[PDB]
Design a protein around this ligand. Structure first.
Ligand SMILES: O[C@@H]1[C@@H](O)[C@H]2OC[C@H]3O[C@H](OC[C@H]4O[C@H](OC[C@H]5O[C@H](OC[C@H]6O[C@H](OC[C@H]7O[C@H](OC[C@H]8O[C@H](OC[C@H]9O[C@H](OC[C@@H](O2)[C@H]1O)[C@H](O)[C@@H](O)[C@@H]9O)[C@H](O)[C@@H](O)[C@@H]8O)[C@H](O)[C@@H](O)[C@@H]7O)[C@H](O)[C@@H](O)[C@@H]6O)[C@H](O)[C@@H](O)[C@@H]5O)[C@H](O)[C@@H](O)[C@@H]4O)[C@H](O)[C@@H](O)[C@@H]3O
Ligand SMILES: O[C@@H]1[C@@H](O)[C@H]2OC[C@H]3O[C@H](OC[C@H]4O[C@H](OC[C@H]5O[C@H](OC[C@H]6O[C@H](OC[C@H]7O[C@H](OC[C@H]8O[C@H](OC[C@H]9O[C@H](OC[C@@H](O2)[C@H]1O)[C@H](O)[C@@H](O)[C@@H]9O)[C@H](O)[C@@H](O)[C@@H]8O)[C@H](O)[C@@H](O)[C@@H]7O)[C@H](O)[C@@H](O)[C@@H]6O)[C@H](O)[C@@H](O)[C@@H]5O)[C@H](O)[C@@H](O)[C@@H]4O)[C@H](O)[C@@H](O)[C@@H]3O
Ligand SMILES: [Ca+2]
Ligand code: NA
Length: 700
């Protein structure tokens, strides 16, 4: 109804802090409305607070109510917030009372630092992530001038702007305003920094090649990253080297003390093998990160124990993967972080990996980078062969295209392809072109939207006309309704392309919801939101090649309310797998599985001292792969469940909460206790299963 927003002023609260709960209400009923707005706050099954205010609104008028609440004294507790305004409608949010974000991290990012961004605008984008998703830490991505010289100075003076490695202008005042805004919501700012990277031409900085790591035993070929312009490179160094540690840890401290960061997000490039030090000693790089990290933590904590937060990216996460055991078991990190590539493609394989990190780390929190739909040209597609084209024609003579063909020889001034699209709602749209190019170099075309020039786009060379890509994209704001998107070959464009299609790059809500459910039911969170409410499509965080539509935004608001409100049941140290015992889940009238099998309801059994926890994740109508696009699950109603429990257990009450249902509010279910040949059991009916239900059963 007319409850438009419910939220709090900060993302996280210390015990005893005042919480301002805001309620944005609008009357759109027809005539005047009078009544009460009732607040109820729950901790898991138990109500802990109520209050009410009268609310009278003429038709069409709006107001924001404020309810004040003192964060209760027990540290590390999540709460669900219900606002009930009768026939005007209802709303919800969640509250996290934690003195330390690293126990329950909800990790977002900032990757854009434009000088034109005002203090107000910096505050707005941070507030929005804080308010909508309770984001409590932000990874500041590519804020630094050089990987080995993070704050650019002229003599003793900090430069007001600098150009990053991709020639983006970074504004100091904008960065500082964002950090301030993060702190204002009780958030923490984590500075991206590599564990072992310099930029090119590092000698004049006092960095020695003798600290480096090499691909050969004669120190002639230093490990590097080559960005493809003959100018911009990273060079790699030995994390165990005392001089490299001295140098880069000094950079970390400079970043903390000068820029006001609260910690370092330590990064790497992932597996590199057959590594040597300068002197030609063969070295296993995978075990060299933990001594570096232990020492980084030491110097950080000595400098400022309130700004000493530390994590490290375990790149290419999978069970027993590269550096997985050494870092997770041995590194002095506050929480664990891992970027998943292609070694944990199934839901169950990824679950197993999260569980290994949790076990190895002593139940430290686990955050995953896991770019949704990364490989997919996901979204509404307009085939180029069905568009309106001038001076080019269609063809079918290169395999790989989608639809009935493609537009070919898009190669001369006057050539045009015009797409008639529809924006179903006002917002940003990612314009993604699928194309071919085997001209021997880059090709270009000019992008126009509704008759206006927007950008020259680059279309990269492939060694075959049979090789298609969809990495030519540009994001634009569109009003709701019809629009025209044109590519034109004009005076100044070069080469040629074959054009397959235009796609409105869009994150698939179904896969994104199921992945987030699987991750948090398994005991991890997911770095996926940042900047001005952008979802993360790619490892280069400024990438805007897909966008979220409002439906997914709303589901993420519900999801983040859920993993905040129920953080105790999802992420606590005592929340452990319950596959170790005599117990079983039985669902009537659906195929079920304990290993995330395709086209089943997937059950996951957890426990604490006080609760027997069963997650139901609905894979009916979908495959067992976490990353790819999915269909809407086959939603279920009145699903009978029978759960076997230990002879030791008696259940007081059965509860079910779902982000999909009433905003995550817990419903108590009637249940029957019984014992048969199979064992002691409990049974009940699940009223609804859409994507994800968490059943939690209180022990007597
Ligand atoms: O400031 C930022 C910089 O610090 C830097 O950050 C990069 C990201 O760092 C993290 O992600 C790490 C990494 O994860 C995955 O790789 C893990 C993978 O590594 C091995 O496989 C290597 C490689 O094999 C194949 O290519 C062969 C190719 O490999 C080397 O070149 C690698 C690429 O180097 C250049 O591009 C670098 C970088 O540029 C952009 O990112 C900018 C940021 O860089 C910057 O903001 C791109 O967006 C990004 O995609 C790209 O990595 C070249 O321009 C590019 O062409 C190369 O591919 C080698 O040097 C070269 O000689 C070889 O020819 C394979 O095709 C390729 O996909 C794979 O990466 C190891 O064997 C595997 O086991 C292991 O799984 C990703 O694949 C990789 O892209 C990521 O960089 C952070 O988490 C990210 O947020 C950072 O963006
Ligand atoms: O089945 C066959 C098709 O696959 C296709 O094969 C093309 C060639 O493939 C191999 O060589 C790969 C090689 O190509 C280029 O160098 C060779 C090139 O050199 C001269 O042209 C120099 C010219 O190069 C660049 O422009 C190229 C091209 O761009 C526009 O067209 C794009 C379309 O190209 C193809 O169709 C047009 C094609 O049609 C006939 O060839 C049929 C074969 O094509 C077919 O059997 C013509 O004889 C040929 O001249 C013409 O290109 C694709 O099929 C279509 O999908 C693409 O849209 C442009 O309109 C056109 O005029 C250009 O020729 C560069 O941009 C430009 O500046 C430069 O001047 C020589 O005159 C050409 O005849 C020759 O092809 C790349 O430069 C190089 O990097 C690649 O590795 C075979 O070995 C060749 O035998 C094939 O011709
Ligand atoms: Ca096509
Ligand atoms: Na899938």
């Amino acid at each position: 109804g007319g409850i438009e927003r419910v939220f709090t002023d900060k993302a996280r609260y210390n015990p005893g802090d005042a919480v301002s709960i805001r309620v944005q209400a609008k009357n759109g009923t027809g005539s005047s409305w009078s009544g009460a707005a009732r607040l109820e706050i729950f901790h898991l099954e138990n109500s802990v607070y109520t209050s009410s205010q009268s609310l009278s609104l003429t038709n069409g008028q709006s107001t924001t109510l404020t309810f004040t609440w003192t964060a209760p004294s027990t540290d590390f507790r999540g709460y669900f917030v219900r606002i009930d305004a009768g026939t005007l409608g209802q709303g919800a949010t969640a509250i996290d009372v934690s003195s330390d974000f690293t126990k329950y991290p909800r990790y977002g990012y900032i990757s854009e630092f434009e000088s034109g961004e005002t203090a107000l605008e910096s505050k707005a984008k941070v507030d929005q992530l804080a308010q909508d998703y309770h984001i409590n830490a932000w990874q500041f991505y590519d804020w630094m001038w050089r990987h080995d010289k993070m704050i650019k100075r002229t003599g003793g003076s900090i430069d007001s702007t600098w150009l990053d490695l991709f020639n983006r202008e970074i504004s100091w005042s904008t960065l500082q305003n964002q950090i301030d805004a993060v702190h204002d919501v009780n958030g923490k700012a984590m500075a991206y920094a590599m564990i072992y990277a310099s930029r090119e031409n590092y000698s004049p900085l006092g960095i020695s090649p003798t600290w480096g790591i090499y691909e050969d035993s004669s120190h002639t070929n230093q490990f590097d990253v080559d960005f493809g312009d003959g100018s911009t490179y990273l060079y790699m160094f030995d994390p165990q080297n005392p001089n490299w540690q001295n140098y880069i840890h000094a950079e970390y401290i400079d970043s903390i003390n000068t820029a006001g960061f609260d910690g370092i997000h330590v990064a790497q490039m992932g597996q590199r093998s057959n590594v040597y030090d300068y002197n030609g000693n063969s070295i296993d790089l995978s075990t060299r990160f933990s001594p570096f990290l232990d020492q980084a933590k030491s110097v950080l904590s000595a400098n400022n124990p309130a700004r000493d937060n530390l994590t490290y990216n375990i790149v290419d996460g999978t069970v027993n993967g590269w550096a997985v055991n050494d870092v997770s078991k041995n590194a002095d990190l506050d929480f664990l972080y891992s970027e998943i590539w292609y070694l944990s493609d199934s839901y169950n394989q990824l679950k197993n990996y999260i569980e290994q990190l949790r076990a190895n780390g002593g139940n430290k929190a686990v955050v995953l980078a896991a770019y949704m739909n990364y490989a997919d040209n996901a979204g509404t597609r307009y085939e180029a062969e069905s568009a309106s084209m001038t001076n080019v024609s269609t063809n079918t003579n290169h395999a790989g295209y989608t639809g009935s063909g493609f537009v070919d020889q898009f190669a001369s001034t006057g050539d045009k392809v015009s797409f008639a699209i529809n924006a179903p709602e006002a917002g940003d749209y990612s314009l993604v072109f699928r194309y071919g190019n085997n001209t021997g170099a880059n090709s270009t075309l000019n992008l126009y939207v509704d008759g206006n020039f927007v950008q020259k786009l680059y279309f990269f060379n492939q060694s075959s006309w049979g090789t298609w890509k969809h990495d030519a994209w540009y994001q634009v704001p569109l009003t709701q309704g019809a629009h025209t998107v044109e590519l034109r070959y004009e005076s100044g464009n070069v080469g040629a392309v074959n054009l397959d299609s235009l796609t409105l790059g869009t994150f698939d809500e179904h896969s994104v919801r199921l992945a987030d459910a699987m991750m948090s039911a398994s005991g991890a969170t997911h770095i996926e939101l940042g900047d001005d409410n952008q979802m993360l499509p790619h490892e280069y965080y400024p990438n805007r090649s897909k966008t979220m539509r409002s439906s997914l935004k709303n589901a993420m608001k519900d999801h983040y309310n859920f993993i905040t409100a129920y953080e105790n049941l999802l992420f606590d140290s005592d929340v452990v797998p319950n596959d170790t015992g005599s117990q079983f889940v039985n669902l009537t009238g659906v195929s079920a599985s304990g290993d995330g099998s395709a086209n089943t309801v997937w059950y996951i059994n957890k426990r604490t001292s006080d609760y027997n926890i069963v997650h139901l994740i609905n894979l009916l109508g979908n495959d067992n792969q976490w990353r790819n696009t999915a269909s809407q699950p086959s939603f279920q109603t009145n699903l009978p469940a029978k759960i076997y429990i230990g002879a030791d257990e008696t259940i007081s009450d059965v509860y079910l909460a779902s982000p999909d249902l009433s905003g995550g509010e817990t419903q108590e279910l009637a249940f029957t206790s019984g014992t048969d040949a199979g064992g002691k059991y409990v049974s009940f009916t699940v009223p609804e299963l859409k994507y994800w239900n968490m059943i939690y059963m209180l022990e007597h």
